[PDB]
Design a protein around this ligand. Structure first.
Ligand SMILES: NC(=O)[C@H]1CCCN(C(=O)[C@H]2Cc3cccc(Cl)c32)C1
Ligand SMILES: [Zn+2]
Length: 139
């Protein structure tokens, strides 16, 4: 579980979105595992606008934050699951680090702000759905 609260928007993993998220839908992309819904209260998270490849993510399965080096957002093959068939997920960034299914939603941050959220993992790797290209989250 986990979300990004910026302005009048809530950003979540598309496979974990609630009925409220779908009834206040702004945008969704199955290929990126993202869904954005509208909120009444204001969000104060700063979104990073950079090409940083180092940062810190929150791992709920260890109740700990971990520093990681991560790759550039790209198309990466993702195993079939209860939410999606086997496919390429776009805008995905990999790192060497611990992750378990319930870790999806944990925030990844660099010195400039919020980079993205945990979305994939397995075998000692963790995947992050990038949000730095969504320039409309601030306007
Ligand atoms: N974005 C997706 O397609 C995910 C849908 C839910 C499943 N998914 C995962 O990667 C799960 C399976 C697993 C094992 C260790 C860590 C994690 Cl985060 C996961 C993929
Ligand atoms: Zn940065």
């Amino acid at each position: 579980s986990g979300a990004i609260y910026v302005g009048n928007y809530r950003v979540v993993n598309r496979h974990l979105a609630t009925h409220n998220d779908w009834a206040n839908l702004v945008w969704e992309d199955s290929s990126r595992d993202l869904l954005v819904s509208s909120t009444t209260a204001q969000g104060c998270d700063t979104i990073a606008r950079c090409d940083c490849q180092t940062g810190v993510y929150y791992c709920s399965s260890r109740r700990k934050h971990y520093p990681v080096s991560f790759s550039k957002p790209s198309l990466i093959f993702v195993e079939a699951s209860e939410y999606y068939p086997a496919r390429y997920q776009s805008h995905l960034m990999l790192a060497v680090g611990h992750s378990e299914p319930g870790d999806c939603g944990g925030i990844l941050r660099c010195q400039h702000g919020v980079v993205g959220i945990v979305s994939t993992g397995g075998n000692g790797l963790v995947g992050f759905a990038d949000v730095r290209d969504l320039l409309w989250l601030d306007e």
